């Protein structure tokens, strides 16, 4: 197709699967233009077949890139370079003409709400990375669909990558292959480009057979151009470009433009003993219990929880005013450590087959191991750590990396919701905010209004986790659990959320805030959690139904005395678990005030400032 005076623009002869001729016009140009830049040795157009999948895994195996886990059905283990183990927020940038479209201008001068880079600066960064980056490697072309095919809310992308690990994982986490290209036709697609940044011959040493370029790692988003461009990292959040990059950052901006929402929320369906089912969404920060909640095993008899998704929601008010949500993903990319029969039995049943593990320990009989797995091993069974060394319980360091993962098909979840792929989405009746707060924040409260509910989201704070580069357990702001993921100005995001109240016939969800992670004076968890969280969901259910089970406090509604079912617990310290201290909350509100003044400033909606003033006043009166 392409004109040329010589022979170095048409890449037809380097195609090892599929055809550039069979590709839609704009797809061909996208692939070929980037082939000209990156200079791959081969181009593989992914078809999404099981044959393609097994053969690629086998190839990675023979190359030492992955290992087969012999104990399980079609399960695999990758060990990364220790420099490439999580998201890096400081190297995650969005490109816009004006900085203020991307982040509010902070009064202090350092934004905690995203990272902006000028188009001039990015072009320099791009030219210093991508030319020739795929030399000696295969460029895989991944046609992928976010959302279930046929969904009005579904969006398709093309990811170019030089990483087989990215291909395999994208097969799990998205709908990918030939049928997606057929669905696309001559339509629009998000342009996604990824490279590990290690052209052959290697100029730097390879660590644990894991190609990466930590020094040059850059995860860039160009909303105007509809492009995502990621360099130097193979880790999930950095490399699986449909997930955080498209489904959150790109899509949140599109959402604001088009009147819907793209959120860091799980979706679950809960059924009560009276035969009633409601769908709930929940925004918790990374590694703060979303996956546990999404596929929870309720301890309360007659209650059932079913899973729609554990990470991302795309939501839109329909003509009927119902807030309808879909899961854009096709799998779960869940945190491994802490996963056990005790904490998450439904996950355990999911990850036994067709699952890729990254940075977990391996047992000598070909099984997986991590901190908190709560399964003893037979005598004689030994452990190889994520660092490919022999590991024993007394080794000081963990057998698995704290941010190690499973990447597993959603269809395999034993309690996957019957409607998890329904084109119309599911109706959300309650939205839950929450994070890790060791002190001051009660087990559960309910917002006083939509506007107060938006403030509660905006005010969210949670302990730092291992999901990114932030060390320790320092309590950080994480509004709407979206801090690492805003595709545009957080102030405008708040305004967008607030605008939902004025939408025709809108049936606004009840908004709650939970704290599973409150500790007492000597650092013990006040709440058993996991399956016991069904007791809090029960109370939320009744509140949505309009049950008179609430008591007014300065921070919102809490359960009345004896309103929460605590049967089979009994020892629970309800005094301090539900306690609200004037002193803590005076401190809390002043901290929120200063944060919003600094970080949001001229872009802070009046309604949010008003809620802040109201809360300060309610506290001053207690
Ligand atoms: Mn997440
Ligand atoms: Na490896």
Coordinates of C-alpha atoms and ligand atoms in Angstrom, one line a residue:
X1 CA 0.0 0.0 0.0
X2 CA 2.4 2.7 1.1
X3 CA 4.2 4.7 -1.7
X4 CA 8.0 4.7 -1.6
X5 CA 11.0 5.6 -3.8
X6 CA 13.0 2.7 -2.3
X7 CA 12.2 -0.4 -0.1
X8 CA 12.1 0.7 3.6
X9 CA 8.6 2.0 4.2
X10 CA 6.5 -1.1 3.3
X11 CA 6.9 -3.7 6.1
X12 CA 4.8 -6.4 4.4
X13 CA 7.8 -8.7 4.1
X14 CA 8.4 -8.7 7.9
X15 CA 4.9 -9.8 8.8
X16 CA 5.0 -13.3 10.4
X17 CA 1.3 -13.5 11.2
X18 CA -1.7 -11.9 9.6
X19 CA -1.6 -9.3 6.8
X20 CA -1.0 -5.5 6.5
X21 CA -3.3 -5.8 3.5
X22 CA -6.2 -7.2 5.6
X23 CA -5.9 -4.5 8.2
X24 CA -8.1 -1.4 8.3
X25 CA -6.5 1.6 6.6
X26 CA -5.7 3.5 9.8
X27 CA -4.5 0.4 11.6
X28 CA -2.0 -0.3 8.8
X29 CA -0.7 3.2 9.0
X30 CA -0.4 3.1 12.8
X31 CA 1.5 -0.3 12.7
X32 CA 3.7 0.6 9.7
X33 CA 4.5 4.2 10.9
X34 CA 5.7 2.8 14.2
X35 CA 7.5 -0.1 12.5
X36 CA 9.4 2.5 10.5
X37 CA 10.4 4.2 13.8
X38 CA 11.1 1.3 16.1
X39 CA 12.6 -0.9 13.4
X40 CA 11.3 -4.3 14.7
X41 CA 12.7 -7.4 13.0
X42 CA 9.2 -8.9 12.6
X43 CA 5.5 -8.0 12.9
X44 CA 3.1 -10.4 14.5
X45 CA -0.6 -9.5 14.1
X46 CA -2.3 -11.2 17.1
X47 CA -5.3 -13.4 16.4
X48 CA -6.2 -14.1 20.1
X49 CA -6.3 -17.9 19.5
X50 CA -5.5 -20.5 22.1
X51 CA -2.9 -21.9 19.7
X52 CA -1.2 -18.5 19.5
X53 CA -1.3 -18.2 23.3
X54 CA 0.2 -21.6 24.1
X55 CA 2.9 -21.3 21.5
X56 CA 4.0 -17.9 22.8
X57 CA 4.0 -19.2 26.4
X58 CA 6.1 -22.2 25.3
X59 CA 8.5 -19.8 23.5
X60 CA 8.9 -17.6 26.6
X61 CA 9.5 -20.8 28.6
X62 CA 12.3 -22.0 26.3
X63 CA 13.8 -18.5 26.4
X64 CA 13.9 -18.5 30.2
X65 CA 11.5 -15.5 30.4
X66 CA 8.8 -17.6 32.2
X67 CA 8.4 -20.9 34.0
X68 CA 5.5 -23.4 33.9
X69 CA 3.9 -24.1 37.2
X70 CA 3.7 -27.9 37.1
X71 CA 1.2 -28.3 40.0
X72 CA -1.6 -26.4 38.1
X73 CA -3.5 -26.4 34.8
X74 CA -1.9 -24.0 32.3
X75 CA -0.3 -21.7 34.9
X76 CA 2.9 -19.7 34.6
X77 CA 5.4 -17.7 36.6
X78 CA 7.4 -14.6 35.6
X79 CA 10.2 -13.1 37.8
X80 CA 11.1 -9.5 37.0
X81 CA 14.1 -7.3 37.3
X82 CA 13.8 -5.9 40.9
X83 CA 13.8 -2.3 39.3
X84 CA 10.6 -3.0 37.4
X85 CA 8.0 -4.2 40.1
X86 CA 5.2 -1.6 40.3
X87 CA 3.7 1.6 38.8
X88 CA 5.9 4.7 39.0
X89 CA 3.7 7.8 39.4
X90 CA 6.6 10.2 39.0
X91 CA 7.3 8.9 35.5
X92 CA 3.6 8.8 34.5
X93 CA 2.8 11.9 32.5
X94 CA -0.1 13.5 30.6
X95 CA 0.5 15.8 27.6
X96 CA -1.7 18.9 27.0
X97 CA -1.3 22.3 25.5
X98 CA -2.1 23.9 28.9
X99 CA -0.9 22.4 32.2
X100 CA -4.2 23.5 33.9
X101 CA -6.2 21.1 31.6
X102 CA -4.2 18.2 33.2
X103 CA -3.8 19.3 36.8
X104 CA -4.9 22.2 38.9
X105 CA -2.0 24.7 39.5
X106 CA -0.9 24.0 43.0
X107 CA -0.2 27.0 45.2
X108 CA 2.8 25.3 46.7
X109 CA 4.1 24.5 43.1
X110 CA 4.2 20.7 43.4
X111 CA 1.1 18.8 42.3
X112 CA 0.0 15.7 44.1
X113 CA -2.8 15.3 41.5
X114 CA -1.0 14.2 38.4
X115 CA 2.1 15.0 36.3
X116 CA 2.1 17.3 33.2
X117 CA 4.6 17.4 30.4
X118 CA 4.6 19.9 27.5
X119 CA 4.3 18.5 24.0
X120 CA 7.7 20.0 23.3
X121 CA 9.3 18.2 26.2
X122 CA 7.6 14.9 25.3
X123 CA 8.8 15.0 21.7
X124 CA 12.4 15.3 23.0
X125 CA 11.8 12.4 25.5
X126 CA 10.2 10.3 22.7
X127 CA 13.0 10.9 20.2
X128 CA 15.5 10.0 22.9
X129 CA 13.8 6.6 23.4
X130 CA 11.8 5.1 20.6
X131 CA 13.9 5.3 17.4
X132 CA 15.4 1.8 16.8
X133 CA 14.1 0.5 20.2
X134 CA 12.7 -2.8 18.8
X135 CA 15.7 -3.8 16.7
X136 CA 16.0 -7.5 16.6
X137 CA 12.6 -8.0 18.2
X138 CA 9.0 -8.9 17.2
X139 CA 6.5 -6.1 17.2
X140 CA 3.2 -7.7 18.3
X141 CA 0.0 -5.9 17.2
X142 CA -2.7 -6.5 19.8
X143 CA -6.3 -5.6 18.8
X144 CA -8.2 -5.3 22.0
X145 CA -11.6 -4.4 23.2
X146 CA -12.4 -2.7 26.6
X147 CA -15.9 -3.9 27.7
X148 CA -18.0 -6.7 26.4
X149 CA -18.4 -6.7 22.6
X150 CA -21.7 -5.2 21.7
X151 CA -21.7 -2.8 24.7
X152 CA -22.6 0.8 23.8
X153 CA -19.9 1.6 26.3
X154 CA -17.2 -0.6 24.7
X155 CA -14.0 0.9 23.3
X156 CA -11.3 -0.7 21.1
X157 CA -7.6 -0.1 21.0
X158 CA -4.5 -1.3 19.2
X159 CA -1.4 -2.0 21.3
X160 CA 2.0 -2.4 19.7
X161 CA 4.5 -4.1 22.0
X162 CA 7.9 -5.9 21.8
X163 CA 7.0 -7.9 24.9
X164 CA 5.4 -11.5 24.7
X165 CA 4.5 -11.1 28.4
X166 CA 2.4 -8.1 27.5
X167 CA 0.6 -10.1 24.8
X168 CA -0.2 -13.1 27.1
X169 CA -1.5 -10.8 29.9
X170 CA -3.5 -8.6 27.5
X171 CA -5.2 -11.8 26.3
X172 CA -6.4 -12.3 29.9
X173 CA -7.1 -8.7 30.8
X174 CA -8.9 -7.6 27.6
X175 CA -10.9 -9.2 24.8
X176 CA -8.3 -9.5 22.1
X177 CA -7.8 -10.9 18.6
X178 CA -9.2 -11.2 15.1
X179 CA -12.9 -10.6 16.0
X180 CA -12.0 -7.2 17.5
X181 CA -10.4 -6.1 14.2
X182 CA -13.6 -7.2 12.5
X183 CA -15.7 -5.3 15.0
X184 CA -13.5 -2.2 14.6
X185 CA -13.7 -1.9 10.8
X186 CA -12.8 1.7 9.7
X187 CA -13.7 3.0 13.2
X188 CA -11.6 4.8 15.8
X189 CA -9.2 3.2 18.2
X190 CA -6.9 4.3 21.0
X191 CA -3.3 4.2 19.6
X192 CA -1.2 2.4 22.2
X193 CA 2.6 1.9 21.8
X194 CA 4.8 0.1 24.2
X195 CA 8.5 -0.9 24.3
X196 CA 10.7 -2.5 27.0
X197 CA 13.5 -0.2 25.7
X198 CA 16.1 -2.9 25.1
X199 CA 17.0 -3.1 21.3
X200 CA 19.2 -6.0 20.3
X201 CA 22.1 -6.4 20.6
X202 CA 21.7 -5.5 24.3
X203 CA 23.8 -2.5 25.4
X204 CA 23.1 -3.1 29.1
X205 CA 23.1 -6.4 31.1
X206 CA 19.8 -8.4 31.3
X207 CA 18.6 -9.1 34.9
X208 CA 16.6 -12.3 35.5
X209 CA 15.8 -12.5 31.8
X210 CA 13.5 -9.4 32.1
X211 CA 14.0 -6.7 29.5
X212 CA 13.4 -3.2 30.9
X213 CA 15.0 0.3 30.9
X214 CA 14.4 1.7 34.4
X215 CA 16.4 5.0 33.8
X216 CA 14.3 5.8 30.7
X217 CA 10.9 4.5 32.0
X218 CA 8.2 6.9 30.8
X219 CA 4.4 6.3 30.7
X220 CA 2.8 9.0 28.6
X221 CA -0.7 9.9 27.7
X222 CA -1.7 12.2 24.8
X223 CA -5.6 12.6 25.0
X224 CA -5.9 15.1 22.0
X225 CA -4.0 12.7 19.7
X226 CA -5.8 9.6 21.2
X227 CA -2.4 8.1 22.0
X228 CA -0.7 6.2 24.9
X229 CA 3.1 5.8 24.7
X230 CA 4.9 3.7 27.3
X231 CA 8.7 3.0 27.5
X232 CA 11.1 1.0 29.7
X233 CA 8.7 -1.0 31.9
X234 CA 7.1 -4.4 31.5
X235 CA 5.0 -4.3 34.8
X236 CA 1.2 -4.6 34.4
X237 CA 0.1 -1.0 35.2
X238 CA 2.9 0.4 33.0
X239 CA 2.6 -2.0 30.1
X240 CA -1.0 -3.3 29.9
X241 CA -2.1 -0.1 28.2
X242 CA -5.9 -0.8 28.1
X243 CA -6.0 -0.8 31.9
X244 CA -4.8 2.3 33.8
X245 CA -3.7 4.2 30.8
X246 CA -6.8 3.9 28.6
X247 CA -9.6 2.7 30.9
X248 CA -8.8 5.3 33.6
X249 CA -6.6 8.2 32.4
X250 CA -7.7 8.6 28.7
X251 CA -11.3 7.4 29.4
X252 CA -11.9 9.8 32.4
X253 CA -11.2 12.7 30.2
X254 CA -13.5 11.3 27.4
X255 CA -16.1 10.6 30.1
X256 CA -16.1 14.2 31.2
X257 CA -16.4 15.4 27.6
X258 CA -19.3 12.9 26.9
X259 CA -21.2 12.9 30.2
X260 CA -20.3 9.5 31.7
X261 CA -17.7 8.4 34.3
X262 CA -14.6 6.2 34.3
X263 CA -13.6 5.2 37.9
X264 CA -11.2 3.2 40.0
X265 CA -14.2 1.2 41.3
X266 CA -15.1 -2.5 41.8
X267 CA -18.6 -3.5 40.8
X268 CA -20.4 -6.2 42.8
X269 CA -24.0 -7.6 43.0
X270 CA -25.4 -8.4 46.5
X271 CA -28.5 -10.5 47.3
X272 CA -30.2 -10.5 50.6
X273 CA -32.2 -13.3 52.4
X274 CA -35.5 -11.6 51.1
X275 CA -34.5 -12.3 47.4
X276 CA -33.5 -8.8 46.6
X277 CA -30.4 -8.0 44.6
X278 CA -28.6 -4.6 44.4
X279 CA -25.4 -3.6 42.6
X280 CA -22.7 -1.6 44.4
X281 CA -19.6 0.3 43.3
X282 CA -16.5 0.9 45.5
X283 CA -13.5 3.1 45.1
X284 CA -10.6 2.0 47.3
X285 CA -7.0 2.8 46.6
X286 CA -4.6 0.2 45.1
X287 CA -4.1 -2.8 47.4
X288 CA -6.8 -1.7 49.9
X289 CA -9.2 -4.6 49.6
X290 CA -11.2 -4.1 46.4
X291 CA -10.6 -7.6 45.1
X292 CA -11.5 -9.1 48.5
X293 CA -14.7 -7.2 48.6
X294 CA -15.6 -7.7 44.9
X295 CA -15.6 -11.5 45.3
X296 CA -16.4 -11.7 49.0
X297 CA -17.7 -14.8 50.6
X298 CA -20.4 -13.5 53.0
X299 CA -20.4 -14.9 56.6
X300 CA -24.1 -13.8 57.0
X301 CA -26.4 -16.7 56.2
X302 CA -28.7 -16.1 53.2
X303 CA -26.5 -13.3 51.7
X304 CA -24.8 -13.7 48.4
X305 CA -22.1 -11.6 46.7
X306 CA -21.3 -11.9 43.0
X307 CA -18.5 -10.2 41.1
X308 CA -18.8 -7.9 38.0
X309 CA -15.3 -6.4 38.3
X310 CA -12.6 -5.7 40.8
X311 CA -10.8 -2.6 39.5
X312 CA -12.4 -0.3 36.9
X313 CA -16.0 0.9 36.2
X314 CA -17.4 2.7 33.2
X315 CA -20.7 4.4 34.3
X316 CA -23.5 6.4 32.7
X317 CA -26.9 7.6 33.7
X318 CA -29.4 6.1 31.2
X319 CA -32.6 7.7 29.8
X320 CA -34.4 6.1 32.9
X321 CA -32.0 7.9 35.2
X322 CA -30.3 4.7 36.4
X323 CA -26.6 4.8 36.9
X324 CA -25.5 1.9 34.7
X325 CA -22.1 0.3 35.1
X326 CA -19.9 -2.0 33.0
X327 CA -16.6 -3.7 33.7
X328 CA -14.2 -2.7 30.8
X329 CA -11.8 -5.5 31.8
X330 CA -11.8 -9.2 31.0
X331 CA -9.7 -10.4 33.9
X332 CA -8.3 -9.7 37.4
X333 CA -4.8 -8.4 37.9
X334 CA -4.9 -8.9 41.6
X335 CA -2.3 -8.5 44.4
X336 CA -1.1 -11.9 45.5
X337 CA 0.3 -11.6 49.1
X338 CA -2.5 -11.9 51.7
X339 CA -4.6 -14.0 49.3
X340 CA -5.8 -17.2 51.1
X341 CA -8.8 -19.5 51.7
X342 CA -9.4 -17.3 54.8
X343 CA -9.2 -13.9 53.1
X344 CA -10.4 -14.6 49.6
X345 CA -11.6 -18.2 48.8
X346 CA -13.2 -17.3 45.5
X347 CA -9.9 -15.9 44.2
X348 CA -8.1 -19.1 45.2
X349 CA -10.6 -21.1 43.1
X350 CA -10.1 -18.6 40.2
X351 CA -6.3 -18.7 40.0
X352 CA -5.8 -22.5 39.9
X353 CA -6.0 -22.5 36.0
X354 CA -5.0 -20.4 33.0
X355 CA -3.3 -17.8 35.3
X356 CA -0.1 -15.9 35.0
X357 CA 1.8 -15.1 38.2
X358 CA 4.4 -12.5 38.5
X359 CA 7.0 -12.2 41.3
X360 CA 5.5 -14.8 43.6
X361 CA 7.5 -17.7 45.2
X362 CA 7.6 -21.2 43.7
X363 CA 7.4 -24.4 45.7
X364 CA 9.4 -27.5 44.6
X365 CA 6.3 -29.4 43.5
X366 CA 5.5 -26.6 41.0
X367 CA 3.0 -24.5 43.0
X368 CA 2.8 -20.9 44.1
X369 CA 3.6 -19.3 47.4
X370 CA 3.4 -15.9 49.1
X371 CA 3.1 -14.1 52.5
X372 CA -0.3 -14.7 54.0
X373 CA -1.2 -17.7 51.8
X374 CA -2.1 -19.5 55.1
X375 CA -1.4 -23.0 53.6
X376 CA 1.3 -25.2 55.2
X377 CA 3.5 -27.3 52.9
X378 CA 4.3 -31.0 53.3
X379 CA 7.7 -31.7 54.8
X380 CA 10.3 -31.8 52.1
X381 CA 8.6 -29.2 50.0
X382 CA 11.1 -26.3 49.4
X383 CA 10.6 -22.7 48.3
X384 CA 12.3 -20.6 45.6
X385 CA 11.7 -16.9 46.2
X386 CA 10.8 -14.2 43.6
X387 CA 14.5 -13.4 43.5
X388 CA 15.2 -17.0 42.2
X389 CA 17.0 -18.1 45.4
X390 CA 16.3 -20.8 48.0
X391 CA 14.0 -19.3 50.6
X392 CA 13.2 -20.3 54.2
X393 CA 10.7 -18.7 56.7
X394 CA 13.6 -17.2 58.7
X395 CA 15.2 -15.3 55.8
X396 CA 14.1 -11.8 57.0
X397 CA 12.9 -10.8 53.5
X398 CA 9.6 -12.0 51.9
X399 CA 9.4 -15.0 49.6
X400 CA 7.2 -13.0 47.3
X401 CA 7.5 -9.3 46.3
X402 CA 4.9 -7.2 48.2
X403 CA 3.3 -6.1 44.8
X404 CA 3.4 -9.5 43.2
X405 CA 0.4 -10.4 41.1
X406 CA -1.9 -13.0 39.6
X407 CA -3.4 -12.2 36.2
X408 CA -6.5 -14.4 35.8
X409 CA -9.6 -14.8 33.5
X410 CA -12.7 -13.2 35.0
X411 CA -14.9 -15.9 33.5
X412 CA -13.2 -18.4 35.9
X413 CA -14.4 -16.7 39.1
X414 CA -17.0 -19.1 40.6
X415 CA -19.2 -16.2 41.6
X416 CA -18.8 -14.1 38.5
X417 CA -22.1 -12.2 38.1
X418 CA -24.5 -13.4 35.4
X419 CA -24.6 -9.8 34.1
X420 CA -20.9 -9.1 34.1
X421 CA -20.9 -9.0 30.3
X422 CA -24.3 -7.5 29.7
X423 CA -24.2 -4.7 27.1
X424 CA -26.5 -2.4 29.1
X425 CA -24.5 -2.6 32.3
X426 CA -25.8 -3.0 35.9
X427 CA -27.7 -0.4 37.9
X428 CA -25.5 1.0 40.7
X429 CA -27.5 1.9 43.8
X430 CA -24.7 2.6 46.2
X431 CA -21.1 4.0 45.9
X432 CA -18.6 3.2 48.6
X433 CA -15.4 5.2 49.4
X434 CA -12.7 4.0 51.8
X435 CA -9.0 3.5 52.5
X436 CA -6.5 2.5 55.2
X437 CA -6.9 4.7 58.2
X438 CA -5.4 3.3 61.4
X439 CA -7.1 5.9 63.5
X440 CA -10.1 8.2 63.9
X441 CA -12.4 7.1 61.0
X442 CA -15.3 4.9 62.1
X443 CA -16.2 1.5 60.4
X444 CA -18.9 3.0 58.2
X445 CA -20.7 6.2 57.6
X446 CA -23.2 7.6 55.1
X447 CA -23.0 10.9 53.3
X448 CA -25.6 13.5 54.0
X449 CA -26.3 14.4 50.4
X450 CA -24.8 14.0 46.9
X451 CA -22.7 17.2 47.4
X452 CA -21.4 15.9 50.8
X453 CA -20.8 12.5 49.1
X454 CA -18.6 14.2 46.5
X455 CA -16.7 15.9 49.3
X456 CA -16.2 12.6 51.1
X457 CA -14.7 11.2 47.9
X458 CA -12.5 14.3 47.5
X459 CA -11.3 14.1 51.2
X460 CA -10.2 10.4 51.0
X461 CA -6.9 9.6 52.7
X462 CA -5.2 6.2 52.9
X463 CA -1.9 4.5 54.0
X464 CA 0.7 4.2 51.2
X465 CA 0.9 0.7 49.7
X466 CA 3.3 -1.3 47.6
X467 CA 1.3 -0.6 44.4
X468 CA 3.6 2.3 43.4
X469 CA 6.9 3.9 44.5
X470 CA 5.6 5.3 47.8
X471 CA 7.3 3.7 50.8
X472 CA 6.1 3.3 54.4
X473 CA 2.5 3.5 55.6
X474 CA 2.4 7.4 55.4
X475 CA -1.3 8.5 55.1
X476 CA -1.6 10.2 51.7
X477 CA -4.5 11.9 50.0
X478 CA -6.2 9.7 47.4
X479 CA -9.4 11.5 46.3
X480 CA -11.9 9.0 44.8
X481 CA -9.0 6.5 44.8
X482 CA -8.0 8.3 41.6
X483 CA -4.9 10.2 42.6
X484 CA -2.6 8.2 40.2
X485 CA -5.2 8.1 37.5
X486 CA -6.9 11.5 36.8
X487 CA -6.9 12.1 33.0
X488 CA -7.6 15.8 33.6
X489 CA -7.9 18.6 36.1
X490 CA -9.2 17.2 39.5
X491 CA -11.2 20.4 40.1
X492 CA -13.1 19.9 36.8
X493 CA -13.5 16.2 37.9
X494 CA -15.3 17.3 41.1
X495 CA -17.4 19.7 39.1
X496 CA -18.2 16.8 36.7
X497 CA -19.3 14.6 39.6
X498 CA -21.3 17.4 41.2
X499 CA -23.1 18.1 37.8
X500 CA -24.7 14.6 38.0
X501 CA -27.2 15.9 40.6
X502 CA -28.8 18.2 38.0
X503 CA -29.2 15.5 35.3
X504 CA -32.8 14.7 34.2
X505 CA -34.5 12.0 36.2
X506 CA -31.1 11.0 37.8
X507 CA -31.4 8.3 40.5
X508 CA -28.4 9.3 42.5
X509 CA -26.7 6.4 44.4
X510 CA -26.3 6.5 48.2
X511 CA -22.7 7.3 49.1
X512 CA -20.9 5.6 52.0
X513 CA -17.4 5.7 53.5
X514 CA -15.9 2.6 55.1
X515 CA -12.8 1.9 57.2
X516 CA -11.8 -1.8 57.4
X517 CA -8.4 -0.9 58.7
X518 CA -8.9 1.0 62.0
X519 CA -6.5 -0.1 64.8
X520 CA -6.6 0.3 68.6
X521 CA -3.9 1.8 70.9
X522 CA -1.4 -1.1 70.6
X523 CA -1.9 -1.5 66.9
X524 CA -4.5 -4.3 66.7
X525 CA -7.2 -4.3 64.0
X526 CA -10.6 -3.5 65.5
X527 CA -12.5 -5.2 62.7
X528 CA -12.2 -8.9 61.5
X529 CA -13.0 -7.8 58.0
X530 CA -13.1 -10.0 54.8
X531 CA -16.3 -12.1 54.9
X532 CA -17.5 -10.2 58.0
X533 CA -17.7 -7.0 55.8
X534 CA -21.1 -8.5 54.7
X535 CA -22.5 -7.0 58.0
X536 CA -21.6 -3.5 56.8
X537 CA -23.0 -4.2 53.3
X538 CA -26.3 -5.4 55.0
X539 CA -26.6 -2.0 56.7
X540 CA -25.9 -0.2 53.4
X541 CA -28.6 -2.4 51.7
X542 CA -31.3 -1.5 54.2
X543 CA -30.3 2.2 54.1
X544 CA -30.8 2.2 50.3
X545 CA -34.2 0.6 50.9
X546 CA -34.9 3.6 53.2
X547 CA -34.6 1.7 56.5
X548 CA -34.6 3.8 59.6
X549 CA -31.3 2.4 60.8
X550 CA -29.2 5.6 60.9
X551 CA -28.1 8.1 63.6
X552 CA -26.8 11.7 62.6
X553 CA -23.2 12.6 63.5
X554 CA -21.0 15.5 62.4
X555 CA -19.4 13.4 59.7
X556 CA -22.6 11.8 58.3
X557 CA -25.0 9.0 59.3
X558 CA -23.7 6.0 61.3
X559 CA -25.6 2.8 62.2
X560 CA -27.9 3.2 65.2
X561 CA -27.1 1.3 68.4
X562 CA -27.7 -2.4 67.7
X563 CA -28.5 -1.6 64.0
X564 CA -25.5 -3.6 62.8
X565 CA -25.6 -7.4 63.1
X566 CA -22.7 -8.4 65.3
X567 CA -23.9 -12.0 66.1
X568 CA -21.0 -14.4 66.1
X569 CA -18.5 -11.7 66.9
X570 CA -19.2 -10.4 70.4
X571 CA -15.7 -9.4 71.4
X572 CA -15.7 -6.4 69.0
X573 CA -14.8 -3.1 70.6
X574 CA -17.7 -1.0 69.4
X575 CA -16.7 2.0 71.6
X576 CA -13.5 2.8 69.7
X577 CA -14.5 1.2 66.3
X578 CA -17.4 3.6 66.0
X579 CA -15.9 6.4 68.1
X580 CA -15.8 9.9 66.8
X581 CA -13.3 12.3 68.5
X582 CA -13.7 16.1 68.3
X583 CA -9.9 16.5 68.4
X584 CA -9.2 14.0 65.6
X585 CA -11.8 15.5 63.4
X586 CA -10.7 19.1 64.1
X587 CA -7.3 18.0 62.9
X588 CA -8.8 16.1 60.0
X589 CA -10.8 19.0 58.7
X590 CA -7.9 21.5 58.9
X591 CA -5.7 19.1 57.0
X592 CA -8.4 18.6 54.3
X593 CA -8.9 22.4 54.1
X594 CA -5.1 23.1 53.5
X595 CA -4.9 20.2 51.0
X596 CA -7.8 21.4 48.9
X597 CA -6.7 25.1 49.1
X598 CA -3.2 24.2 47.9
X599 CA -3.9 21.4 45.5
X600 CA -7.2 22.5 43.9
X601 CA -7.3 26.3 44.5
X602 CA -9.0 28.2 41.7
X603 CA -10.5 25.0 40.4
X604 CA -12.2 23.8 43.6
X605 CA -15.9 23.9 43.1
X606 CA -17.9 26.2 45.4
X607 CA -20.0 23.2 46.6
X608 CA -16.9 21.4 47.8
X609 CA -15.6 24.4 49.8
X610 CA -19.2 24.7 51.2
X611 CA -19.2 21.1 52.3
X612 CA -15.8 21.7 54.0
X613 CA -17.2 24.7 55.9
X614 CA -20.3 22.8 56.9
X615 CA -18.2 19.9 58.3
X616 CA -15.9 22.3 60.2
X617 CA -19.0 23.8 61.7
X618 CA -20.6 20.5 62.7
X619 CA -17.3 19.6 64.4
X620 CA -17.0 22.9 66.2
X621 CA -20.4 22.3 67.8
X622 CA -19.7 18.8 69.2
Ligands
LIG1 MN1 -6.4 -0.7 40.6
LIG2 NA1 12.6 -13.8 34.6

